[PDB]
């Protein structure tokens, strides 16, 4: 889309400097069997099906990202939260930035119960809504600085009848692959749930959750070759 340097999955994640106008097309070619991000914060992509997100997006003739945040992340259940940024995610005005599709609900510090959030269908009448979410996990001593828990955290999401589970990882992190290149201590896991027209999504989470802000609104069908 006349934008530079930024891969297809990179735009699919809402990485800063890759917000941009998305045109519609009735035919699309598929050129990445393994979509790769060269930018935003290091991700353990194979933990989930997140690699197939942009190739799923091109299957829709008309695709657009939500103009407003699906939810406001600061007042979510679990105490007031700051909105996260990072140096591995350079915002052209600030040495720090993050995905526009998600938010880092980092507490202002005690163990917490599993928290439940419904996700609205704020997209228009018929366009399928892909909701992108994830969770962060760092090593033991920084999980203590960040959260009130060094134990593995529990996560699970449910929408359209698809109910998944997750559990974070502490320590022994794989090297930093497909990111902004700056040495970090933690890692990121990203997943997405699709919401049919009218229906809601649910996410059960603990400390370390990445709450969603910008959700995809996709409609139409585009031929794929």
């Amino acid at each position, epitope marked *: 889309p006349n934008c530079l340097n930024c891969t297809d999955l990179d735009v699919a994640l809402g990485r800063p400097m890759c917000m941009g106008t998305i045109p519609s097309a009735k035919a699309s070619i598929l050129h990445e069997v393994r979509p790769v991000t060269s930018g935003c914060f290091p991700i353990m992509h194979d933990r989930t099906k997140i690699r197939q997100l942009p190739n799923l997006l091109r299957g829709y003739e008309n695709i657009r990202l939500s103009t407003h945040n699906v939810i406001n992340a600061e007042r979510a259940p679990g105490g007031p939260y*700051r*909105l*996260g*940024t*990072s*140096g*591995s995610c350079p915002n052209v005005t*600030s*040495r*720090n930035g993050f995905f526009a599709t998600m938010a*880092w609900a*980092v507490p*202002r510090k005690t163990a917490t119960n599993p928290l439940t959030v419904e996700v609205p269908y704020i997209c228009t009448k018929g366009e399928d809504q892909i909701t992108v979410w994830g969770f962060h996990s760092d090593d033991k001593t*920084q999980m203590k*600085n*960040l959260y009130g828990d060094s134990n593995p955290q529990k996560f699970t999401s449910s929408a359209n009848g698809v109910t998944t589970h997750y559990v974070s990882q502490i320590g022994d992190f794989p090297n930093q692959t497909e990111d902004g290149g*700056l040495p*970090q201590s933690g890692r990121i896991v990203v997943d997405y749930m699709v919401q049919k027209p009218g229906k809601t999504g649910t996410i059960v989470y603990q400390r370390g959750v990445l709450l969603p802000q910008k959700v995809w609104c996709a409609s139409g069908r585009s031929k794929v070759i």
Partner: antibody
Amino acid sequence: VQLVESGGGLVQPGRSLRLSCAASGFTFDDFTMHWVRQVPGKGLEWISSINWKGNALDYAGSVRGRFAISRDNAKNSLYLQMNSLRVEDTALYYCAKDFRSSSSMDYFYYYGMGVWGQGTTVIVSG
Amino acid sequence: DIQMTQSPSSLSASVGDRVTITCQASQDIRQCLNWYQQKPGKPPKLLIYDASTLETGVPSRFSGRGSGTHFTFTISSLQAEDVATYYCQQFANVPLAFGGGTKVEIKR
């Protein structure tokens, strides 16, 4: 906005001491905090910088391994635990607020230091 | 590490003169520089941040310019209460470096 440094005085070389920076007038847990010393006659020297959490700690080489920065967002106090003191740690230690409420959480949370205190005098001598 | 070669070392000028202070960097910081003024025996007040923008309350005769490795601080019309030791400071790298300082005094 106020920043008050306290706890500086006369100490032996090699012993321990701790300064306290009592903040008031702004949301202390949103900003990153700094430490800058100025030995009398010379200029400003950066000591350490802690972010709005206690998760990230940066130290200048001369103090790395000997000093320790920390903060209490409830009692809005910035701390600096200096250990194995040297006579060239003798300086006027300033407490500084970073203007930007940057929740960087990785790097670059330090910016223009808008607000400074009046400092506390530390003289390491036997 | 980035060394702040601030210049001059000490100057003097009559009231109304144009005062200029340059700060070089050994490596590119590109905006992350800012200027402080030393009220004698008193705190540092921030005048210029991000090397060109002007802080709340500080007068119009103070200006900063520069990018990359060269930065310029200028007082358009020197006043008597400007007697101070001014300091530049880069915050582009995790270690922070302050310039050597420049002593400003009035020629009367």
